[PDB]
Amino acid sequence: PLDTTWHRPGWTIGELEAAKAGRTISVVLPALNEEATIESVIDSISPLVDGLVDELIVLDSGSTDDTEIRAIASGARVVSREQALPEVPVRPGKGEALWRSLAATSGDIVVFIDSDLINPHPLFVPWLVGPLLTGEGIQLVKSFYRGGRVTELVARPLLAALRPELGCVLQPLSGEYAASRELLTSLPFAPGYGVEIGLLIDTFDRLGLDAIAQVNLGVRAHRNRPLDELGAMSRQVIATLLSRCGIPDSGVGLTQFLDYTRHTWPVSLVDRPPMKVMR
Amino acid sequence: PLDTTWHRPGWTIGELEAAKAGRTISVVLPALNEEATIESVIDSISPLVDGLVDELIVLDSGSTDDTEIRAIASGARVVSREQALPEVPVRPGKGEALWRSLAATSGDIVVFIDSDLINPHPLFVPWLVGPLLTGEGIQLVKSFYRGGRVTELVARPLLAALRPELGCVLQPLSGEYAASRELLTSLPFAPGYGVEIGLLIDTFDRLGLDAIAQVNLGVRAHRNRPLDELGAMSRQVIATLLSRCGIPDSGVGLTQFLDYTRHTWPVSLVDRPPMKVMR
Numbered sequence: 140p141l142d143t144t145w146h147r148p149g150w151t152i153g154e155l156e157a158a159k160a161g162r163t164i165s166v167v168l169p170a171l172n173e174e175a176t177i178e179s180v181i182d183s184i185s186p187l188v189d190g191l192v193d194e195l196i197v198l199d200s201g202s203t204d205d206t207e208i209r210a211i212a213s214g215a216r217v218v219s220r221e222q223a224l225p226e227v228p229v230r231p232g233k234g235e236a237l238w239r240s241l242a243a244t245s246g247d248i249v250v251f252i253d254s255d256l257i258n259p260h261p262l263f264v265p266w267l268v269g270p271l272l273t274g275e276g277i278q279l280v281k282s283f284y285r286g287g288r289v290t291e292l293v294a295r296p297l298l299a300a301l302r303p304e305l306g307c308v309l310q311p312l313s314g315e316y317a318a319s320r321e322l323l324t325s326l327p328f329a330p331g332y333g334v335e336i337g338l339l340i341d342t343f344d345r346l347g348l349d350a351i352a353q354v355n356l357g358v359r360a361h362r363n364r365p366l367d368e369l370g371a372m373s374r375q376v377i378a379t380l381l382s383r384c385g386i387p388d389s390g391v392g393l394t395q396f397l398d399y400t401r402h403t404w405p406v407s408l409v410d411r412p413p414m415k416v417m418r
Numbered sequence: 419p420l421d422t423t424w425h426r427p428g429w430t431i432g433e434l435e436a437a438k439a440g441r442t443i444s445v446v447l448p449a450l451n452e453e454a455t456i457e458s459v460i461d462s463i464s465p466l467v468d469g470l471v472d473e474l475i476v477l478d479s480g481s482t483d484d485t486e487i488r489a490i491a492s493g494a495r496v497v498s499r500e501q502a503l504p505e506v507p508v509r510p511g512k513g514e515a516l517w518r519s520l521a522a523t524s525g526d527i528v529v530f531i532d533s534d535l536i537n538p539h540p541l542f543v544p545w546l547v548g549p550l551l552t553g554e555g556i557q558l559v560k561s562f563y564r565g566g567r568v569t570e571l572v573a574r575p576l577l578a579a580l581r582p583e584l585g586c587v588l589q590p591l592s593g594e595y596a597a598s599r600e601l602l603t604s605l606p607f608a609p610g611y612g613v614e615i616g617l618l619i620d621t622f623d624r625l626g627l628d629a630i631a632q633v634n635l636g637v638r639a640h641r642n643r644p645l646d647e648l649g650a651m652s653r654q655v656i657a658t659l660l661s662r663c664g665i666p667d668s669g670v671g672l673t674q675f676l677d678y679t680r681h682t683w684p685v686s687l688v689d690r691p692p693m694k695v696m697r
């Protein structure tokens with residue numbers, strides 16, 4: 140039911156670029172304190188700039204390490220959350236960074252790549268844009284790869300329960316994906332870590348499976364977070380997914396008991412609206 | 419909001435036994451292929467038999483290893499699913515084993531202990547029965563301990579979303595707990611791995627928090643399953659939890675893509691009814 144490219148696409152950078160046909164391509168790297176990895180990621184993509192890729196920015200989501208200076212030193216344009224859209228006060232979380240990035244880019248096609256990847260392949264961007272460039276009706280491309288605890292324990296089983304039509308999607312939460320600006324500026328953006336699952340469900344509801352493709356990127360490595368930070372992420376994924384399914388979420392943050400101690404993590408039920416309204 | 423015993427209970431086996439006041443206590447160990455651990459678990463509890471504990475059975479849920487012979491050799495009464503309730507054909511899964519165990523025991527109080535625990539403390543059963551024996555209105559006692567991936571990523575965040583009143587429960591899926599027969603024979607039993615979360619939500623809805631206590635067992639160790647088996651368990655926990663919250667579940671099993679291969683795991687939306695109807 141779902142256009143899946145199972146092996147390495149056969150296209151080439153010169154073919155894909157020809158297929159642009161006046162369309163532009165922006166790449167956004169969201170980054171929060173990724174000084175150890177930001178440079179390797181930027182370098183994997185910057186050789187494409189002024190060719191297949193027209194624009195690369197790092198959206199610096201409030202880093203307090205050396206993320207920004209190392210990104211500048213790799214030749215990337217770095218855009219803070221405030222600069223992307225300064226009339227609107229900044230909220231925390233990943234979804235805010237990606238939503239704002241629409242105002243700081245102008246490509247007809249937008250590619251998101253996480254900045255915490257350990258040594259990413261230089262064809263990620265070409266592999267993701269393939270179906271948007273050479274297909275018909277594809278508006279969103281998700282990646283899969285490779286062990287993804289939230290994906291396999293939370294998102295895929297809840298999708299099977301509540302949107303089983305998306306059961307064929309191998310990595311619904313994947314941070315590497317591309318989509319048309321027309322789609323992205325028409326969809327709301329869930330806060331925090333809810334943004335990927337929200338975009339997938341909203342895209343499906345509006346365009347169906349035929350507008351979605353997925354592409355094998357082989358294997359990917361990244362910062363494996365401790366279980367407690369995953370708990371808050373799972374809570375936000377659940378909150379965003381239930382809302383899309385018409386189920387009322389309590390809005391109560393996850394509490395954890397670490398001779399134990401207690402901490403309550405934030406959860407948000409507030410989406411950003413389609414960036415179109417900002418026109 | 420929730421009666422919590424945070425340090426080691428101060429009671430003694432002789433005090434607790436005196437407090438029985440004619441009430442009986444059954445212990446059930448569900449077991450599916452636990453030959454490596456069944457013996458250490460039985461031995462931790464059998465010294466209590468004919469004193470605090472009136473009855474110990476192993477409910478052999480279809481083992482094909484040496485579980486049954488090793489349990490017999492530790493002096494335990496072993497009851498198959500068929501023998502517990504032979505007029506009713508056997509279904510797979512943990513919940514079926516626990517539900518049937520009500521027909522093969524007669525204690526006024528029933529204690530469940532998983533049979534895959536690595537070296538369990540001999541006071542587990544005394545610590546769990548404490549609040550049922552010495553409290554008032556306690557009808558269910560859950561344990562906590564100790565890293566519990568389904569609990570921290572699936573069950574606690576979904577409870578926070580959908581039954582936030584149970585947010586103070588530290589280990590909702592814990593396999594070690596005790597309850598009155600009157601409660602257990604009044605509640606349905608969810609299939610598979612849904613049984614613990616189902617019993618907790620059903621108990622709360624019927625009796626509120628004041629009927630539930632929890633007790634610190636310190637640290638517990640057990641067979642840490644691979645992520646893919648956890649995926650099917652999470653799917654069933656989600657299915658049981660959504661049903662209790664009035665949310666329709668698709669009934670679609672989780673599919674996993676392991677040059678990948680596909681497998682679909684069973685999920686069940688069929689509860690067993692209150693054992694009372696079998697009277």
Ligand SMILES: O=c1ccn([C@@H]2O[C@H](COP(=O)(O)OP(=O)(O)O)[C@@H](O)[C@H]2O)c(=O)[nH]1
Nearest residue numbers: 169170171173200231232233236253254255
């Ligand atoms: O408020 C935030 C949180 C995260 N990120 C970025 O979003 C990406 C994915 O975040 P994370 O690693 O925490 O998620 P994971 O992939 O580990 O589940 C990373 O490049 C982060 O730098 C961000 O820009 N802003």
Ligand SMILES: O=c1ccn([C@@H]2O[C@H](COP(=O)(O)OP(=O)(O)O)[C@@H](O)[C@H]2O)c(=O)[nH]1
Nearest residue numbers: 448449450452479510511512515532533534
């Ligand atoms: O169909 C089944 C599945 C499991 N069990 C028992 O239920 C307990 C808990 O099962 P499991 O270890 O798979 O769950 P976990 O604690 O690892 O999440 C164990 O003693 C199993 O032997 C059972 O009696 N029947």
Ligand SMILES: O=C(O)[C@@H](COP(=O)(O)O)O[C@H]1O[C@H](CO)[C@@H](O)[C@H](O)[C@H]1O
Nearest residue numbers: 286287288289290312313314332363364
């Ligand atoms: O899927 C997951 O379990 C997590 C983290 O992966 P691990 O459990 O650390 O292997 O990462 C997912 O979610 C993130 C936030 O939504 C995305 O940025 C990742 O790309 C996605 O894989």
Ligand SMILES: O=C(O)[C@@H](COP(=O)(O)O)O[C@H]1O[C@H](CO)[C@@H](O)[C@H](O)[C@H]1O
Nearest residue numbers: 565566567568569591592593611642643
């Ligand atoms: O909470 C969990 O993640 C799992 C398995 O624990 P691990 O992730 O292997 O540490 O076990 C829970 O669920 C089982 C089935 O419902 C219960 O039998 C366990 O007692 C409970 O801890």
Ligand SMILES: [Mn+2]
Nearest residue numbers: 253255361362
């Ligand atoms: Mn990451």
Ligand SMILES: [Mn+2]
Nearest residue numbers: 532534640641
């Ligand atoms: Mn276990």
